[PDB]
RNA sequence: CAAGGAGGUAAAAAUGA
RNA sequence: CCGAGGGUAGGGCCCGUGACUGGGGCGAAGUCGUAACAAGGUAGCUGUACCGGAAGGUGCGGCUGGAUCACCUCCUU
RNA sequence: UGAAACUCAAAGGAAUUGACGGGGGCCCGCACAAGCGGUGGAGCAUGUGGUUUAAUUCGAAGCAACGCGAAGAACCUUAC
RNA sequence: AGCGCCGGCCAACUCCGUGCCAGCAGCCGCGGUAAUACGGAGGGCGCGAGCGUUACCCGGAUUCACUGGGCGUAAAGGGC
């Protein structure tokens, strides 16, 4: 399946915090405040200047591990976006953001995208009244993503909803914390989300 | 203010009785990513001197780049010796599709998306001069009618 | 040339030729060894490279390299011929895949053992 | 095949013991391969010219050479030290 | 003269080399006394009979001895270890 | 003052680790 | 009558193989000489002919992918 | 007219900096020529090679190693 | 949870063993005492119910050039 294992090593290697765990990320035990250098025995050796291939590889790997996705689904979304009207990179992020597990993370039903993926897979997440237990379901505008009526009284689900009580969601989303529901209003444009990836370098990475 | 990127640093050799007596050459390119790019070639007995000499020559040798929203206005193809370069304008969202040397020149000039191709000899020195004279030959619709006015 | 000259004679296409005729358009081919020995390399190299003359299925009798450290091959050994040239040895245009019919895998190897045909060792892991 | 040691050879063979033993093991490795195929094998066997003419040389190290000669039944060693 | 080793000769001379330190150089000063005084000297010089037609022997340890025969300018070594 | 076209040539001496 | 096929005789093309023999390439610092690169010690190369262990040498003609970079022999102050 | 097997990781063109020439122009040094005294021949000293030896400790190897490390080997030195 | 790789192309470095041996190999090439190139280990990179290898096709190959090549000396002007 997807990547299972140490996750701080991924952010430490890319040199940027990718926020892949949740509260441990905004903690001082985050380990990018502790050790902001690549992992391994040669971490505190001095950075040899990366090639043009290393630059493109690093930013592609960074964007891929932010969403925690495999590399054929990543590249299938990529040519799905390229054989598509509009700007290839901005479309790409719009199809990546349309994933059900990502909409669950963004709505604050989860602390992490991996927790979001588990909650969707376990049927705690319902889309437009019916169950969708597949974390790759492309959510289209106007869909109401909610929580199952069997899973409404869950200690983890409520604590994350009461933690999301007061914080704002993105302009392409709506959230009803009291109803345990949200709506995919529109596709996110590229000014709406400002992840630390230069979308142009991953376009010209896959352009071999 | 000016981002300067080194591209080719080689070691040459000069024979005299006793052995080789070496010298290093550095080709650098400078830019502001807003329509201005320059390239220099400095040779000194060691590389930090070489890249400093090359940067000094690079800011002397600079060019106008008439960017249009993300790219070049028309496609241009110039032959410099046996080295030849293709530039083709691309729609917004394709990226700098170029090799090693026109990529470093065009993205420091500010190009978002472009289509290139290196033909003939692919020596980094003469391809770089070919791209620079190709960037020098780019005309807009303003310059076109200002020359075809007759006045 | 001129356009009329290309109408008349036209252009020649590349005519690619195979580096592996003994396999006869097959990925692998079974063969029985006939001579198993050690040969020595070419221009700037020195060793005792282990090869075997194999008379195989397509009626060809070729020489093939035995990769790895140590082998169990003799004059009546059944082997599979993989394909691939050895730069330092003349006439050796093929390889012997290990972990097959009578060519056992290399013992005590643990790094890249999909090549050289070695099983997965389990020392409580 | 018989082994014949000269005194120049034997003093240098016993000079290699007491000083650098990996060299006596290389010498033993070259003699063991020379014992089966005398003009083929390890240590780059090439025929010598201009003064050693009629002798063969196997390189022990990048400097040192094993100069030998061979008959139908014997193997005489001329040197096992230096560059000829 | 010169040293001549048989095939068992050197291989078991190589056995003592891979096995023990005092054996091989004790062996070698016997070789050194044997080249100067071929029939007399250190470690039991004796011509023997009925097994040996004109061949000689010398001591290392009473379990292992040193069998050899000497000609014009030659020193052949027949054995490096024990009797029979 | 200044040059070009024309023409008579060293010997006997080989090798490279 | 035609007719599958079988039999006899004679040809054409292709393939495997053969005592021996001819050159090629590889392993190659074996032996012999010094042909070419410096006027490479006879400028070199070439077509052709003859000869010679061998590179090669020579005859005739051709080419510059060589040479008027010093005294001195034929014609000018 | 005109291939193939096989083999090689190059084969090449112009140009650069050197080095070399039994190529040239100009010019030096006891380099030659002019001149004096020598070595190689004898005897002995000292160093080296070789050989011998228990051991003849080790190094230096064309110029630019060879009375050179020794501007002091009877036991000391001294490593054999 | 496995597989390939960590000299350069090509993302990823240290120690030990070995020592022109054993071996690697697509090219350049590496190995004759500290080998980031062999073998192992630690660590790392790339993918992941897969990962590598071989065989074949297209690409890179504007090295058959219509788009899109050349012919004084690099292969190439027919002797006229
Ligand atoms: S931000 Fe989160 S995933 Fe990144 S290093 Fe910190 S704790 Fe780990
Ligand atoms: Mg052109
Ligand atoms: Mg080698
Ligand atoms: Mg002569
Ligand atoms: Mg018939
Ligand atoms: Mg000559
Ligand atoms: Mg003549
Ligand atoms: Mg000549
Ligand atoms: Mg002729
Ligand atoms: Mg004649
Ligand atoms: Mg003539
Ligand atoms: Mg003519
Ligand atoms: Mg013919
Ligand atoms: Mg004089
Ligand atoms: Mg005298
Ligand atoms: Mg003294
Ligand atoms: Mg790298
Ligand atoms: Mg390997
Ligand atoms: Mg080591
Ligand atoms: Mg490798
Ligand atoms: Mg799958
Ligand atoms: Mg292949
Ligand atoms: Mg094509
Ligand atoms: Mg054309
Ligand atoms: Mg061409
Ligand atoms: Mg030519
Ligand atoms: Mg030509
Ligand atoms: Mg003509
Ligand atoms: Mg004709």
UniProtKB/TrEMBL annotation, chains D, E:
Keywords: Endonuclease, Hydrolase, Nuclease, RNA-binding, Toxin-antitoxin system. It comes from the Bacteria. One of its GO terms (molecular function) is RNA binding. SUPFAM superfamilies: RelE-like (SSF143011). The keyword Nuclease applies. One of its GO terms (biological process) is RNA catabolic process. NCBIfam families: toxin_Txe_YoeB. Belongs to the YoeB family. This is Toxin YoeB. It comes from Escherichia coli. The lineage of its organism: Bacteria, Pseudomonadati, Pseudomonadota, Gammaproteobacteria, Enterobacterales.
């Amino acid at each position: 399946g997807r990547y299972i294992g140490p996750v701080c090593r991924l952010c430490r290697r890319e040199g940027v915090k990718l926020y892949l765990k949740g509260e441990r990320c905004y903690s001082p035990k985050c380990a990018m405040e502790r050790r902001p250098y690549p992992p391994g025995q040669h971490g505190q050796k001095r950075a040899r200047r990366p090639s043009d291939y290393a630059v493109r590889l690093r930013e592609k790997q960074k964007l891929r591990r932010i969403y925690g996705i495999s590399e054929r689904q990543f590249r299938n979304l990529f040519e799905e976006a390229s054989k598509k009207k509009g700007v290839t990179g901005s479309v790409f992020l719009g199809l990546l953001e349309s994933r059900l597990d990502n909409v669950v993370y963004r709505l604050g039903f989860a602390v992490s995208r991996r927790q979001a993926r588990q909650l969707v897979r376990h049927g705690h997440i319902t889309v437009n009244g019916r169950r969708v237990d597949l974390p790759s379901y492309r959510v289209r505008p106007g869909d109401e993503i909610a929580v199952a009526e069997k899973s409404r009284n869950l200690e983890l689900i409520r604590q994350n909803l009461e933690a999301m009580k007061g914080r704002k969601v993105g302009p392409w989303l709506s959230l009803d914390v009291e109803g345990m529901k949200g709506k995919f209003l529109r596709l996110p444009d590229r000014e709406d989300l400002a992840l630390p990836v230069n979308e142009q370098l991953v376009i010209e990475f896959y352009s071999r | 203010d000016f981002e300067e990127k080194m591209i080719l640093i080689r070691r040459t050799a000069r024979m005299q009785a006793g052995g080789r007596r070496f010298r290093f050459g550095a080709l650098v390119v400078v830019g502001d990513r807003q329509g201005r790019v320059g390239l220099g070639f400095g040779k000194a007995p060691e590389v930090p001197l070489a890249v400093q000499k090359a940067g000094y020559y690079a800011r002397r040798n600079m060019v106008e780049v008439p960017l249009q929203n993300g790219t070049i206005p028309h496609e241009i193809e110039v032959e410099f010796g046996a080295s030849k370069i293709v530039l083709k304008p691309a729609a917004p969202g394709t990226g700098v599709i170029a090799g090693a040397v026109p990529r470093a020149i065009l993205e420091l000039a500010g190009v978002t998306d472009i289509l290139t191709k290196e033909l003939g000899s692919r020596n980094p020195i003469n391809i770089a001069y070919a791209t620079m004279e190709a960037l020098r030959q780019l005309r807009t619709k303003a310059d076109v009618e200002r020359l075809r006015k007759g006045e | 040339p001129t356009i009329n000259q290309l109408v008349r004679k036209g252009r020649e296409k590349v005519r690619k030729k195979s580096k592996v005729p003994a396999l006869k358009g097959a990925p692998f081919r079974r063969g029985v060894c006939t001579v198993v020995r050690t040969v020595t390399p070419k221009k700037p190299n020195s060793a005792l490279r282990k090869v075997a003359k194999v008379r195989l299925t397509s009626g060809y009798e070729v020489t093939a390299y035995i990769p790895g450290e140590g082998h169990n091959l003799q004059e009546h050994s059944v082997v599979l011929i993989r394909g691939g040239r050895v730069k330092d040895l003349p006439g050796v245009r093929y390889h012997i895949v290990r972990g097959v019919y009578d060519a056992a895998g290399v013992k005590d190897r643990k790094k890249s053992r999909s090549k050289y045909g070695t099983k997965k060792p389990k020392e409580a892991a | 095949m018989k082994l014949i040691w000269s005194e120049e050879s034997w003093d240098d063979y016993l000079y290699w013991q007491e000083t650098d033993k990996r060299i006596v093991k290389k010498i033993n490795e070259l003699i063991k391969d020379t014992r089966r195929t005398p003009f083929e094998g390890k240590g780059k066997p090439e025929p010598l010219k201009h003064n050693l003419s009629g002798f063969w040389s196997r390189r022990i190290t990048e400097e040192h050479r094993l100069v030998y000669a061979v008959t139908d039944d014997s193997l005489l060693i001329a040197a096992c030290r230096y560059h000829y």
